[PDB]
UniProtKB/Swiss-Prot annotation:
Lineage, top ranks: Eukaryota, Metazoa, Chordata, Craniata, Vertebrata
Subunit structure: Monomer.
Effect of R14C: In CTRCT4; progressive punctate cataract with early onset; causes disulfide-linked oligomers formation with consequent protein aggregation and precipitation
The protein's name: Gamma-crystallin D
Reported function: Crystallins are the dominant structural components of the vertebrate eye lens.
Disease named in the record: Cataract 4, multiple types: An opacification of the crystalline lens of the eye that frequently results in visual impairment or blindness. Opacities vary in morphology, are often confined to a portion of the lens, and may be static or progressive. CTRCT4 includes crystalline aculeiform, congenital cerulean and non-nuclear polymorphic cataracts, among others. Crystalline aculeiform cataract is characterized by fiberglass-like or needle-like crystals projecting in different directions, through or close to the axial region of the lens.
Keyword Repeat: yes
Any one Pfam family match given in the protein's UniProt record, by short name: Crystall
Residue ranges of the region described as Connecting peptide: 83-86
Length: 173
């Protein structure tokens, strides 16, 4: 579904509508302080080409960048996160799919209660899209994880391997 991004808060000012991924919004927004997500979850990125801080958005009207927990009004690229009927993800202790491992099909608010490691060094997203969080309780930096192979933590754009919680990307009905 469509997302409309607005330069000013409260859905005011210069705006830009897009139906899918966009690697560089710099030409259409110099800043972003509000957004309307019609349907279909989005990940917003502070920097072009899907880097910088990431923020997860389900459908809804966001009148201020703080409504998506944005630390700033920089939105320079965006992904449409594909809907999925099921979710499956394998997490490994070590790089390149080695060490202790654990597989999830549901959300988990404290990874360490279930898996005695503070870090995840590789993972395989078998079905669905997920959001991984630096800390437990869905706190800290956010990382979008779509289907695919992730042999080291850099492959999900993180600067370290800390992971404390994870959630399946599911839009409201």
């Amino acid at each position: 579904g469509k997302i409309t991004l607005y330069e000013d808060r409260g859905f005011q000012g210069r705006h830009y509508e897009c139906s899918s991924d966009h690697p560089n919004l710099q030409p259409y927004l110099s800043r972003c302080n509000s957004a309307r997500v019609d349907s279909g979850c989005r990940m917003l990125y502070e920097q072009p080409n899907y880097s910088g801080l990431q923020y997860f958005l389900r459908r809804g009207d966001y009148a201020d960048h703080q409504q998506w927990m944005g630390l700033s009004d920089s939105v320079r690229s965006c992904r449409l996160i594909p809907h999925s009927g099921s979710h499956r993800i394998r997490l490994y202790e070590r790089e390149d799919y080695r060490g202790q491992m654990i597989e999830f099909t549901e959300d988990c608010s404290c990874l360490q209660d279930r898996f005695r490691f503070n870090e995840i060094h590789s993972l395989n997203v078998l079905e669905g899209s997920w959001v991984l969080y630096e800390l437990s309780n869905y706190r800290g930096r956010q990382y979008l994880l779509m289907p695919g192979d992730y042999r080291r933590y850099q492959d999900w754009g993180a600067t370290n391997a800390r992971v404390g919680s994870l959630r399946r990307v599911i839009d409201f009905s």
